[PDB]
Amino acid sequence: RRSIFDAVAQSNCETGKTCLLKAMLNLHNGQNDTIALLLDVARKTQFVNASYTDSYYKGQTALHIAIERRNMTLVTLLVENAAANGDFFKKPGFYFGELPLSLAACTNQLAIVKFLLQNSWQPADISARDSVGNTVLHALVEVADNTVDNTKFVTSMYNEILILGAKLHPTLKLEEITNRKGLTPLALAASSGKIGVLAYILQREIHEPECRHLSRKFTEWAYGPVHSSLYDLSCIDTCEKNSVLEVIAYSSSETPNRHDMLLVEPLNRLLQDKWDRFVKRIFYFNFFVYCLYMIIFTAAAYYRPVEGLPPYKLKNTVGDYFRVTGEILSVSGGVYFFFRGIQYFLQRRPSLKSLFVDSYSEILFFVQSLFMLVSVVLYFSQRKEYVASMVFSLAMGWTNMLYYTRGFQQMGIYAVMIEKMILRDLCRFMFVYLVFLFGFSTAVVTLIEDGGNSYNSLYSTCLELFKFTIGMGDLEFTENYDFKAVFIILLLAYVILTYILLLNMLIALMGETVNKIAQESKNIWKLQRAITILDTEKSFLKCMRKAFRSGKLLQVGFTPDGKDDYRWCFRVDEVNWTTW
Amino acid sequence: LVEVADNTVDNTKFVTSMYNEILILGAKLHPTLKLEEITNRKGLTPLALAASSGKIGVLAYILQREIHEPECRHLSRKFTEWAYGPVHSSLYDLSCIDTCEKNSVLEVIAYSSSETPNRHDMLLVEPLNRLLQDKWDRFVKRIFYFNFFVYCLYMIIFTAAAYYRPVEGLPPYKLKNTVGDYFRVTGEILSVSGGVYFFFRGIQYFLQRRPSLKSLFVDSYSEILFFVQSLFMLVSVVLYFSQRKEYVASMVFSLAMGWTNMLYYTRGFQQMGIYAVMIEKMILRDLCR
Ligand SMILES: C=C(C)[C@]12C[C@@H](C)[C@@]34O[C@](Cc5ccccc5)(O[C@@H]1[C@@H]3C=C(COC(=O)Cc1ccc(O)c(OC)c1)C[C@]1(O)C(=O)C(C)=C[C@@H]41)O2
Ligand SMILES: C=C(C)[C@]12C[C@@H](C)[C@@]34O[C@](Cc5ccccc5)(O[C@@H]1[C@@H]3C=C(COC(=O)Cc1ccc(O)c(OC)c1)C[C@]1(O)C(=O)C(C)=C[C@@H]41)O2
């Protein structure tokens, strides 16, 4: 075999590699003319279809070798006279699918895909799926990397393959096909964060006369420099499969461009449509009930009985009856919040690494309801430590009231700033501040002998050095030291190091954040409103699920089979002067 | 040729071009001789010289240079292994980069006197920026977390033995038949041993570098602080055996200084490693003016 392999390598006329595959691989400038001889010799004596049996490169055949090399003539010769299941092509490796046509499409080889698709000797199957279930369009969308030229040719190839498949097979619906996981090419582009492919798919009009029915953004009329466009909105607002809007919003936040992935033509106005139509009165009746429950909880916490031990027997007074009713309403609200929070994590199962960075408002609403259930537990088992939990519940809830500024734009970017500092710029600076506080507090408490004023306490001396950070500390707070020149050196060093060097450095860090999330979070607020709209829509499913459905059913054209095309469209308008 | 370099796009361009041409021509006439290995009297090599003098352009050229020609390809560093599609995996030569008989490129860039212009971003060249990471992940992230833990476990031996010091009489203090006194004595011994270790680890560091005074505080600040901590406690040892009660004023300074030096170990974290670099720069520049 060495002479044959050596001659094939010389280009002179386990792994399981064949001479044809070896010859094709070891070809320079397409000079491997011995491949024809082997194929011709093989014909005189199944050989062309032989493939490597190695698990790493399982399934690779001659067609793949020629396709990779961009050889039109070699590909045509091989075709005229399979799927690579190897770990190299499964999700150092390159994924393109597991079909020759997917190899052609994923590499921009437009001519080769045309040749394969309508190859007279053997045509390829457009709708075939690999092991993962991905079709061709799934591979094309997966390959996307969000670059102007990259998005350019991926969208171009998608459009070309789509038109060609429609021309050969008008009946079949290619986009509706799904992989094993269940997603569609549009849903996949929405989930994976590929903004370019989503922007293409959502608003794509193909002008050609016959194959116009596979388009979304139509036109209704144009009198002058003005024209009103439609949209298709098929699986956008709601569908059997996951909707584009829900996927973008309920995404794990690992998706790159979630915040500004809603600026595409339909979504940015479909979201607004829902907000104005039937949600602005359900985000103002939910705010009012919360404001009316925090005056039932506050007024019943402020007038709690002070004499004796709990529980307290009722008295024949109107005040006591009202207090009992207030307590019942408060506890009912607490239980409702606890369940509304418990059955939210089961729906998402958010990862710990992003438990606080994506659901902060909900974590807080849950943590509030824990403190009050703990109070219910402690108050019936004859304890008076239930006040320390009711108080925390009250303060936490009043400060959670800020969650409802989610609707306002000017104020919705002010409760987004208090989430971001408390997470990023106030947990670093307390790792870098307690070090100084404890170092100098241990120093000072060790210097003083003390072996009343009672400044021999590591608690009192840690506290008194924290009032040097709010500018409310007495320098001569003790006189028990034996070495004044050291004590008043330590304090004066501490004041400079923390009051003047650390506080005035944390302010700069918060200033940078305030700029950043003051000129960026304008889209995070829109996203938060989008989640609010989605949850509000989900809550009232029983009431007006179908009744409050966006978009109107309209005729678009004629399905190629001969029937009529009716779809749920959303109308938009525009004005343009320079085009005429 | 490397010495003449001044780090300009066109300047780097023709210096690199001339270097490549002279190298190829010398290889063609004399393939046997290794020209780069030659050194001047000081001992440096052209690559080591480009690394020491701060010439980033020549270093970037030399580290990753592939010459495609068929015969004279053996004088190259950045090869290629395979390319299936739009993907290709490159190699590198890393001959005297990680370690060598002559000074390594990595050590020269790091242990430089800091007069070198571009030290901070002179490690972005192809090999170094990932070779450094390789070492970090492979066998150093568990030696910068066992060195942090021992320091955190020694500052709870020093603090707990400083906080419970005897208050009655004059030093030294005779031992008592109590478990508390034995534990205090052990804490003192451990603390003093740590102090001596730090003092020697600091004294034999300056001999290795002999840093200039003008850049004594601008390049070794973390080490100056670790040394100054160990001086205060050796002074305390000196004063405490010679029957004085002024050793508390030094032990206290040692304790505070060490707790605040704990910040040196945020060197590994990225988000927190740029917060202890800000407290060095203000205290030097914006709080002495
Ligand atoms: C993230 C969590 C678990 C958190 C829970 C409590 C303990 C909390 O302290 C923090 C940390 C903290 C503690 C003290 C001062 C600052 C920060 O922040 C909140 C948490 C911080 C707040 C308010 O936080 C906010 O920024 C309001 C807010 C911003 C954005 C939102 O979308 C939002 O919706 C609920 C609420 C108030 C407290 O809940 C409160 O009243 C008490 C007693 C402590 C505050 O821990
Ligand atoms: C540079 C030197 C010699 C220095 C030595 C001592 C006296 C020091 O005051 C300074 C000047 C000073 C004094 C008082 C307030 C601010 C600054 O800064 C440090 C020095 C400043 C510090 C902490 O300095 C830091 O920024 C921490 C740090 C930052 C970056 C690092 O790489 C680092 O590694 C060790 C440590 C704390 C003290 O050591 C301390 O605890 C006491 C009692 C004085 C501080 O002189």
Residue A348 one-letter amino acid: R
Q: Which of A439, A447, A505 sits opposite B248 (nearest CB)?
A: A447
**CB neighbours of B246 closer than 8 A, spacing ≥ 6?**
A483, B239
Burial B194-212 (b: 16+ CB within 10 A, else e): bbeebbeebeeeeeeeebe
Report residue A554: phi and psi, to 5°: -145, 160
Residues A80 and A75: their CA atoms lie apart, in Å, by 9
Three-class SS of A263-327: CCHHHHHHHHHHHHHHHCCCCCHHHHHHHHHHHHHHHHHCCCCCCCCCCCCCCCCHHHHHHHHHH
Tokens linked to B96 = 């005297």
Tell me how long chain B is: 289
The secondary structure of chain A in percent helix, strand, coil, rounded to multiples of 5, reads 55, 5, 40
Asked if omega into A225 is within 30° of 0 (cis), the reply is no
Contact assessment for residue A510 and residue A423, using Cβ atoms and an 8 Å cutoff: no
Question: Tokens 């004059």 appear where?
Answer: B170
Report residue B226: phi and psi, to 5°: -65, -35
CA separation (Å) from A166 to A163, A288, A564? 5, 54, 17
Q: Which of A248, A107, A103 shows the shortest CA–CA distance to A189?
A: A248
Mark yes or no for CB contact B275/A446 under 8 Å: no
Mark yes or no for CB contact B258/A439 under 8 Å: yes
Q: Which of A431, A449, A458 sits opposite B272 (nearest CB)?
A: A431
Q: Which of A251, A146, A235 shows the shortest CA–CA distance to A194?
A: A146
Residues A369 and B164: their CA atoms lie apart, in Å, by 44
Q: Which of B89, B252, B266 sits opposite A443 (nearest CB)?
A: B252
Tokens linked to B187 = 């804490």
Q: Which of A354, A345, A361 shows the shortest CA–CA distance to A399?
A: A361
A563 assigned binding-site residue: no
Tokens linked to B206 = 């300056």
The helices-and-strands tally (H runs, E runs) of chain A is 26, 5
B92 assigned binding-site residue: no
**CB neighbours of A79 closer than 8 A, spacing ≥ 6?**
A63, A115, A116, A119, A121, A122
DSSP assignment of A168-197 equals H-SSS-STT---TT---HHHHHHHTT-HHH
Cα B225 to its chain centre, rounded Å, is: 15
All residues of chain A having their beta carbon less than 8 Å from the beta carbon of residue B156 are none
Three-class SS of A362-404: HHHHHHHHHHHHHHHHHHHCCCCCCHHHHHHHHHHHHHHHHHH
Sign (positive or negative) of CA dihedral A27, A30, A35, A39: positive
**CB neighbours of B115 closer than 8 A, spacing ≥ 6?**
B54, B215
Contact assessment for residue A228 and residue A183, using Cβ atoms and an 8 Å cutoff: no
Q: Which of B162, B172, B193 shows the shortest CA–CA distance to B255?
A: B162
Neighbouring C-alpha atoms within 13 Å toward the C-beta of B64:
12
**CB neighbours of B227 closer than 8 A, spacing ≥ 6?**
B198, B199, B202, B203
Q: Which atom number of ligand 1 is nearest to the Cα of residue A363? A: 3
Q: How many CB atoms lie within 10 A of CB A432?
A: 19
Sign (positive or negative) of CA dihedral B130, B131, B132, B135: positive
Contact assessment for residue A394 and residue A298, using Cβ atoms and an 8 Å cutoff: yes
Cα A465 to its chain centre, rounded Å, is: 44
**CB neighbours of B14 closer than 8 A, spacing ≥ 6?**
none
Q: How many CB atoms lie within 10 A of CB A491?
A: 20
Mark yes or no for CB contact B272/A96 under 8 Å: no
Beta strands in chain B (DSSP E): 80-83, 88-90
Cα B226 to its chain centre, rounded Å, is: 14
Residues A336 and A346: their CA atoms lie apart, in Å, by 16
Three-class SS of A229-266: ECCCCCCCCCCCCCCHHHHHHCCCCCCCCHHHCCCCHH
Residues B246 and A52: their CA atoms lie apart, in Å, by 83
Q: Ligand 2: which residues within 6 Å by Cβ?
A: A 493, 496-497; B 221-222, 225-226, 228, 253, 256-257, 260-261, 263-264, 276, 279-280, 283
Q: How was this structure determined?
A: cryo-EM
Sequence-distant contacts of A440-444: CB under 8 A, at least 24 apart: A440/A465, A440/A490, A440/A493, A440/A494, A440/B256, A440/B259, A440/B260, A441/A465, A442/B159, A442/B162, A442/B163, A442/B255, A442/B256, A442/B259, A443/A490, A443/B252, A443/B253, A443/B255, A443/B256, A443/B259, A444/A487, A444/A490, A444/A491, A444/B252
All residues of chain A having their beta carbon less than 8 Å from the beta carbon of residue B168 are 451
A326 assigned binding-site residue: no
Tokens linked to A179 = 């992989």
Contact assessment for residue B276 and residue A432, using Cβ atoms and an 8 Å cutoff: yes
B267 assigned binding-site residue: yes
Residues A188 and A372: their CA atoms lie apart, in Å, by 43
Q: How many CB atoms lie within 10 A of CB A485?
A: 8
Q: What is the DSSP letter of A535?
A: H
Residues A287 and A273: their CA atoms lie apart, in Å, by 21
Residue of A nearest to B90 (CA): A92
User: Please, after which residues is chain B broken with C–N above 2.5 Å?
Assistant: none
Contact assessment for residue A567 and residue A556, using Cβ atoms and an 8 Å cutoff: yes
Alpha helices (H) in A353-501, listed in sequence order: 355-358, 361-380, 387-400, 409-412, 417-420, 434-447, 458-464, 484-494
Contact assessment for residue A200 and residue A152, using Cβ atoms and an 8 Å cutoff: no
Q: What is the resolution of this structure in A?
A: 3.5
The helices-and-strands tally (H runs, E runs) of chain B is 12, 2
Contact assessment for residue A204 and residue A261, using Cβ atoms and an 8 Å cutoff: no
**CB neighbours of A210 closer than 8 A, spacing ≥ 6?**
A560
Residues A164 and A158: their CA atoms lie apart, in Å, by 10
Contact assessment for residue A551 and residue A570, using Cβ atoms and an 8 Å cutoff: yes
Q: Which residue of B260, B270, B283, B285 is the best one to mutate when testing the A interface, meaning the one whose CB has the most A CBs within 10 A?
A: B260
Residues A440 and A463: their CA atoms lie apart, in Å, by 12
Residues B254 and B158: their CA atoms lie apart, in Å, by 10
Contact assessment for residue A230 and residue A576, using Cβ atoms and an 8 Å cutoff: no
Burial class (CB in 10 A: 0-12, 13-18, 19+), B114: middle
Cα B271 to its chain centre, rounded Å, is: 20
Q: Which residue of B80, B252, B266, B279 is the best one to mutate when testing the A interface, meaning the one whose CB has the most A CBs within 10 A?
A: B252
Residues A355 and A363: their CA atoms lie apart, in Å, by 8
Q: Which of B142, B132, B133, B115 shows the shortest CA–CA distance to B52?
A: B115
Cα B224 to its chain centre, rounded Å, is: 14
Question: Tokens 């080769």 appear where?
Answer: A112
Sequence-distant contacts of A304-311: CB under 8 A, at least 24 apart: A304/A387, A304/A390, A309/A382, A309/A384, A310/A379, A310/A380, A310/A382, A310/A383, A310/A384, A310/A386, A311/A379, A311/A380, A311/A382
Query: Which secondary-structure segment (H or E) carries A503?
Result: helix A503-519
Q: Ligand 1: which residues within 6 Å by Cβ?
A: A 360-361, 364-365, 367, 392, 395-396, 399-400, 402-403, 415, 418-419, 422
What distance in Å separates residue A183's CA from the closest CA in chain B?
27
Residue of A nearest to B88 (CA): A92
Q: What is the DSSP letter of A125?
A: P
Report residue A424: phi and psi, to 5°: -100, -50
A474 assigned binding-site residue: yes
Q: Which of B167, B249, B276 sits opposite A451 (nearest CB)?
A: B167
Cα B248 to its chain centre, rounded Å, is: 34
User: Please, after which residues is chain A broken with C–N above 2.5 Å?
Assistant: 13, 45, 81, 91, 451
Burial class (CB in 10 A: 0-12, 13-18, 19+), B25: exposed
All residues of chain B having their beta carbon less than 8 Å from the beta carbon of residue A107 are 85-86
Question: Tokens 């100056």 appear where?
Answer: B224
Residues A329 and A327: their CA atoms lie apart, in Å, by 5
Residues A75 and A125: their CA atoms lie apart, in Å, by 17
Mark yes or no for CB contact A439/B276 under 8 Å: no
Q: Which residue of B165, B184, B259 is the best one to mutate when testing the A interface, meaning the one whose CB has the most A CBs within 10 A?
A: B259
All residues of chain A having their beta carbon less than 8 Å from the beta carbon of residue B169 are none
Contact assessment for residue A256 and residue A269, using Cβ atoms and an 8 Å cutoff: no
Tokens linked to A578 = 């320079």
Q: How many CB atoms lie within 10 A of CB A549?
A: 12
Contact assessment for residue B60 and residue B125, using Cβ atoms and an 8 Å cutoff: yes
Q: What is the DSSP letter of A417?
A: H
Q: What is the DSSP letter of B177?
A: S
Mark yes or no for CB contact B255/A446 under 8 Å: yes
Sign (positive or negative) of CA dihedral B232, B233, B239, B240: positive
Q: Which of A233, A141, A125 shows the shortest CA–CA distance to A179?
A: A141
Is B286 in a helix, a strand, or coil?
helix
